[PDB]
């Protein structure tokens, strides 16, 4: 029994059991898309300047 994947995983993952899953593997990057409606854009003079 060469040690578990809990202790040997690259990027510092955190292997768990009941769903087989890894946690918090610091690798890659998430892109994001924001479809923002036009109602949220407050005008200039309703904010300090």
């Amino acid at each position: 029994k060469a040690p578990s994947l809990k202790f040997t995983a690259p990027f510092g993952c955190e292997i768990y059991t009941n769903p087989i899953r890894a946690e918090n593997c610091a690798v890659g990057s998430i892109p994001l898309a924001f479809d923002i409606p036009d109602a949220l854009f407050t005008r200039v003079s309703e904010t300090p300047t």
Partner: protein, 49 residues
């Protein structure tokens, strides 16, 4: 008036009255009178302030 200065707070060339100009003046008498733009550059909302 005497020594009046005009700055543009909001400026958006929208179809409605979408621009705010705050005229910083210094008046000899305190009384209402009429503002106007001679050109077709801007169309003012109110006739007097």
């Amino acid at each position: 008036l005497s020594a009046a200065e005009c700055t543009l707070n909001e400026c958006v060339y929208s179809s409605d009255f979408g621009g705010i100009a705050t005229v910083k003046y210094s008046a000899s008498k305190s009384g209402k009178c009429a503002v106007h733009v001679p050109s077709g550059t801007a169309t003012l909302k109110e006739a007097a302030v």
